[PDB]
Write an enzyme that holds these catalytic residues in place. Structure first.
Site, PDB file in Angstrom:
ATOM      1  N   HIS A   1      30.978  44.444  33.338  1.00 35.40           N
ATOM      2  CA  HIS A   1      31.230  45.257  34.512  1.00 35.40           C
ATOM      3  C   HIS A   1      30.454  44.802  35.759  1.00 35.40           C
ATOM      4  O   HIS A   1      31.037  44.868  36.839  1.00 35.40           O
ATOM      5  CB  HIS A   1      30.891  46.732  34.209  1.00 35.40           C
TER       6      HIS A   1
ATOM      7  N   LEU B   1      50.226  44.791  38.729  1.00 37.97           N
ATOM      8  CA  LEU B   1      49.840  46.099  39.217  1.00 37.97           C
ATOM      9  C   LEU B   1      49.312  46.831  38.004  1.00 37.97           C
ATOM     10  O   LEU B   1      49.816  46.641  36.886  1.00 37.97           O
ATOM     11  CB  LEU B   1      51.018  46.850  39.743  1.00 37.97           C
TER      12      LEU B   1
ATOM     13  N   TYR C   1      33.413  55.112  32.970  1.00 36.77           N
ATOM     14  CA  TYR C   1      34.204  56.100  33.699  1.00 36.77           C
ATOM     15  C   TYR C   1      34.278  57.442  32.974  1.00 36.77           C
ATOM     16  O   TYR C   1      34.719  58.426  33.586  1.00 36.77           O
ATOM     17  CB  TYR C   1      35.652  55.608  33.952  1.00 36.77           C
TER      18      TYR C   1
ATOM     19  N   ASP D   1      43.465  49.868  33.776  1.00 31.52           N
ATOM     20  CA  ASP D   1      42.126  49.350  33.916  1.00 31.52           C
ATOM     21  C   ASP D   1      41.169  50.471  33.510  1.00 31.52           C
ATOM     22  O   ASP D   1      41.194  51.550  34.112  1.00 31.52           O
ATOM     23  CB  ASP D   1      41.903  48.948  35.366  1.00 31.52           C
TER      24      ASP D   1
ATOM     25  N   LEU E   1      47.025  50.638  36.671  1.00 30.41           N
ATOM     26  CA  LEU E   1      46.489  51.921  37.079  1.00 30.41           C
ATOM     27  C   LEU E   1      44.985  51.864  36.876  1.00 30.41           C
ATOM     28  O   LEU E   1      44.498  51.410  35.827  1.00 30.41           O
ATOM     29  CB  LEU E   1      47.118  53.043  36.240  1.00 30.41           C
ATOM     30  N   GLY E   2      44.263  52.260  37.919  1.00 34.20           N
ATOM     31  CA  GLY E   2      42.810  52.303  37.916  1.00 34.20           C
ATOM     32  C   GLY E   2      42.389  53.686  37.470  1.00 34.20           C
ATOM     33  O   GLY E   2      43.040  54.682  37.839  1.00 34.20           O
TER      34      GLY E   2
ATOM     35  N   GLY F   1      47.278  31.963  28.259  1.00 39.28           N
ATOM     36  CA  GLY F   1      48.709  32.038  28.191  1.00 39.28           C
ATOM     37  C   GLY F   1      49.212  33.433  28.525  1.00 39.28           C
ATOM     38  O   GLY F   1      50.361  33.594  28.922  1.00 39.28           O
TER      39      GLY F   1
ATOM     40  N   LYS G   1      35.593  47.582  30.140  1.00 39.52           N
ATOM     41  CA  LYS G   1      34.400  46.908  30.628  1.00 39.52           C
ATOM     42  C   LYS G   1      33.141  47.332  29.897  1.00 39.52           C
ATOM     43  O   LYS G   1      32.941  48.517  29.575  1.00 39.52           O
ATOM     44  CB  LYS G   1      34.213  47.207  32.121  1.00 39.52           C
TER      45      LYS G   1
ATOM     46  N   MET H   1      49.506  38.815  32.547  1.00 42.55           N
ATOM     47  CA  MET H   1      48.752  39.953  32.967  1.00 42.55           C
ATOM     48  C   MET H   1      49.545  40.623  34.060  1.00 42.55           C
ATOM     49  O   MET H   1      49.783  39.988  35.082  1.00 42.55           O
ATOM     50  CB  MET H   1      47.397  39.470  33.448  1.00 42.55           C
TER      51      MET H   1
HETATM   52  N1  LIG Z   1      34.862  46.536  38.392  1.00 43.56           N
HETATM   53  C1  LIG Z   1      34.319  47.405  39.234  1.00 43.56           C
HETATM   54  O1  LIG Z   1      33.125  47.390  39.541  1.00 43.56           O
HETATM   55  C2  LIG Z   1      35.235  48.483  39.820  1.00 43.56           C
HETATM   56  C3  LIG Z   1      34.729  49.259  40.854  1.00 43.56           C
HETATM   57  C4  LIG Z   1      35.516  50.185  41.532  1.00 43.56           C
HETATM   58  C5  LIG Z   1      36.842  50.351  41.156  1.00 43.56           C
HETATM   59  N2  LIG Z   1      37.364  49.606  40.089  1.00 43.56           N
HETATM   60  C6  LIG Z   1      38.747  49.869  39.624  1.00 43.56           C
HETATM   61  O2  LIG Z   1      39.596  49.913  40.788  1.00 43.56           O
HETATM   62  C7  LIG Z   1      40.396  51.098  40.710  1.00 43.56           C
HETATM   63  C8  LIG Z   1      40.876  51.448  42.112  1.00 43.56           C
HETATM   64  O3  LIG Z   1      39.776  51.601  43.024  1.00 43.56           O
HETATM   65  P1  LIG Z   1      39.123  53.034  43.422  1.00 43.56           P
HETATM   66  O4  LIG Z   1      39.464  54.105  42.451  1.00 43.56           O
HETATM   67  O5  LIG Z   1      37.693  52.770  43.687  1.00 43.56           O
HETATM   68  O6  LIG Z   1      39.871  53.372  44.791  1.00 43.56           O
HETATM   69  P2  LIG Z   1      41.291  53.081  45.471  1.00 43.56           P
HETATM   70  O7  LIG Z   1      42.372  52.740  44.507  1.00 43.56           O
HETATM   71  O8  LIG Z   1      41.069  52.179  46.631  1.00 43.56           O
HETATM   72  O9  LIG Z   1      41.579  54.548  46.040  1.00 43.56           O
HETATM   73  C9  LIG Z   1      41.694  55.692  45.183  1.00 43.56           C
HETATM   74  C10 LIG Z   1      41.771  56.879  46.124  1.00 43.56           C
HETATM   75  O10 LIG Z   1      42.902  56.729  47.001  1.00 43.56           O
HETATM   76  C11 LIG Z   1      43.898  57.727  46.703  1.00 43.56           C
HETATM   77  N3  LIG Z   1      45.268  57.152  46.654  1.00 43.56           N
HETATM   78  C12 LIG Z   1      45.840  56.449  45.660  1.00 43.56           C
HETATM   79  N4  LIG Z   1      47.142  56.207  45.886  1.00 43.56           N
HETATM   80  C13 LIG Z   1      47.336  56.777  47.057  1.00 43.56           C
HETATM   81  C14 LIG Z   1      48.547  56.800  47.732  1.00 43.56           C
HETATM   82  N5  LIG Z   1      49.651  56.276  47.216  1.00 43.56           N
HETATM   83  N6  LIG Z   1      48.547  57.434  48.920  1.00 43.56           N
HETATM   84  C15 LIG Z   1      47.446  58.001  49.423  1.00 43.56           C
HETATM   85  N7  LIG Z   1      46.285  57.972  48.770  1.00 43.56           N
HETATM   86  C16 LIG Z   1      46.205  57.366  47.574  1.00 43.56           C
HETATM   87  C17 LIG Z   1      43.480  58.365  45.395  1.00 43.56           C
HETATM   88  O11 LIG Z   1      43.790  59.762  45.367  1.00 43.56           O
HETATM   89  P3  LIG Z   1      44.260  60.494  44.020  1.00 43.56           P
HETATM   90  O12 LIG Z   1      43.672  59.787  42.863  1.00 43.56           O
HETATM   91  O13 LIG Z   1      43.742  61.861  44.240  1.00 43.56           O
HETATM   92  O14 LIG Z   1      45.729  60.381  44.084  1.00 43.56           O
HETATM   93  C18 LIG Z   1      41.974  58.206  45.437  1.00 43.56           C
HETATM   94  O15 LIG Z   1      41.379  59.255  46.206  1.00 43.56           O
HETATM   95  C19 LIG Z   1      39.449  52.083  40.046  1.00 43.56           C
HETATM   96  O16 LIG Z   1      40.061  53.246  39.500  1.00 43.56           O
HETATM   97  C20 LIG Z   1      38.866  51.231  38.944  1.00 43.56           C
HETATM   98  O17 LIG Z   1      39.748  51.229  37.804  1.00 43.56           O
HETATM   99  C21 LIG Z   1      36.560  48.666  39.412  1.00 43.56           C
END
Ligand SMILES: NC(=O)c1ccc[n+]([C@@H]2O[C@H](COP(=O)([O-])OP(=O)(O)OC[C@H]3O[C@@H](n4cnc5c(N)ncnc54)[C@H](OP(=O)(O)O)[C@@H]3O)[C@@H](O)[C@H]2O)c1
Length: 315
Positions: A110, A15, A48, A43, A17-18, A9, A77, A12
């Site tokens: 994870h 959008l 991390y 997230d 923040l990662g 229910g 996770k 979520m």
């Molecule tokens: N479950 C899993 O196995 C798993 C694995 C990987 C990721 N994740 C989650 O997914 C989230 C997002 O993926 P990710 O961190 O791997 O990479 P992503 O969101 O694809 O990219 C992050 C990178 O892109 C930059 N960026 C963000 N917004 C931007 C914008 N508006 N304009 C230009 N560049 C931008 C960031 O720079 P700055 O931060 O320097 O601004 C950073 O260098 C992670 O933080 C995590 O929470 C989960």
């Protein structure tokens, strides 16, 4: 939509923040700024190494009455070294304490892969591949279910599970709760339409991680493809008078997938929230989907010989 709805229910937020690679000394202000921008979903993950610092930002915003806990959707996770059934409650409690929260809204396994327990996150052998534990993620799933029963987490899910792995959970004898979410890598170069379609037929929500390809991933060597600076997507951005980033974030959203872009930069955290003001016309959607190179950014090659390594399967 603004939110997708899980089978329990719960709404979520679409959008979030990662926080992977968000350094401890930056993630508190990033979390604070995001909540100030309207982001209601964060997230996180034990691995991390910044959940304490995420907890600080959140605590500040919650004591400062900027948000009510019910308005927040915090995900964390369970790490691979904590898959043994008896280790799961402990890991969820460390994360809760670090986050300074009483319950999580979603807790994810994870990776399907359990690694040998110990403090080292990726226990490597002499040949350099990772050491497996003695567990099957179906046993881990059962301990994840006990967290729901006790009210420690409101929903449980998986991440990087292939469809046969999800099937083994769905077909488990005694299954009490099914994965509410499968969080998986999705972007133009890995459009994932088969796995997405599969989870959606099973009533599992999909969260697309690395929506921008992850420019800051340690293994980025110079010859890599950069989604953000790929002239093709920059062109469709130019038309939209939006950035490559905002359009690569709108794409999963238009596919009815939760997106969690990572940024510690305040300006980019605001830009990434500035995606709810347009739609991509159906040709664009098809123009990005056609870039499916099946290029993984998160392949976990170190664990490719693991019995539950997820990526030898097609989807
Ligand atoms: N479950 C899993 O196995 C798993 C694995 C990987 C990721 N994740 C989650 O997914 C989230 C997002 O993926 P990710 O961190 O791997 O990479 P992503 O969101 O694809 O990219 C992050 C990178 O892109 C930059 N960026 C963000 N917004 C931007 C914008 N508006 N304009 C230009 N560049 C931008 C960031 O720079 P700055 O931060 O320097 O601004 C950073 O260098 C992670 O933080 C995590 O929470 C989960």
């Amino acid at each position: 939509a603004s939110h997708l709805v899980l089978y329990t229910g719960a709404k979520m937020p679409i959008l979030g923040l990662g926080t992977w690679k968000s350094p401890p000394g930056k993630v508190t202000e990033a979390v604070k700024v995001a909540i100030d921008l309207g982001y209601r979903h964060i997230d996180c993950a034990h691995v991390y190494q910044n959940e304490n610092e995420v907890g600080l930002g959140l605590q500040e915003k919650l004591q400062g009455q900027v948000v009510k806990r019910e308005d927040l959707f915090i995900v964390s996770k369970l790490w691979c070294t904590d898959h043994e059934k008896n280790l799961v409650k402990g890991a969820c409690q460390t994360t809760l304490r670090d986050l300074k929260l009483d319950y999580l809204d979603l807790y994810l396994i994870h990776w399907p892969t359990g690694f040998k327990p110990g403090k080292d996150p990726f226990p490597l052998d002499g040949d350099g591949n990772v050491v497996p534990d003695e567990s099957d993620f179906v046993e881990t799933w059962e301990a994840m279910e006990e967290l729901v029963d006790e009210g420690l987490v409101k929903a449980i899910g998986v991440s990087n599970f292939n469809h046969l792995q999800v099937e083994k959970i769905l077909n488990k004898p005694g299954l009490k709760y099914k994965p509410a979410v499968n969080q998986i890598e999705v972007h133009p170069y890995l459009t994932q339409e088969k796995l997405i379609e599969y989870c959606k037929s099973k009533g599992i929500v999909v969260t697309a991680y690395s929506p921008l390809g992850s420019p800051d991933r340690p293994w980025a060597k110079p010859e890599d493809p950069s989604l953000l600076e790929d002239p093709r997507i920059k062109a469709i951005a130019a038309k939209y008078n939006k950035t490559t980033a905002q359009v690569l974030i709108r794409f999963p959203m238009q596919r009815n997938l939760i997106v969690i872009p990572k940024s510690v930069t305040p300006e980019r955290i605001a830009e990434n929230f500035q995606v709810f003001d347009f739609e991509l016309s159906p040709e664009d959607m098809n123009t990005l989907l056609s870039y499916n190179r099946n290029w993984r950014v998160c392949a976990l090659m170190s664990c490719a010989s693991h019995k539950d390594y997820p990526f030898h399967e097609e989807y």
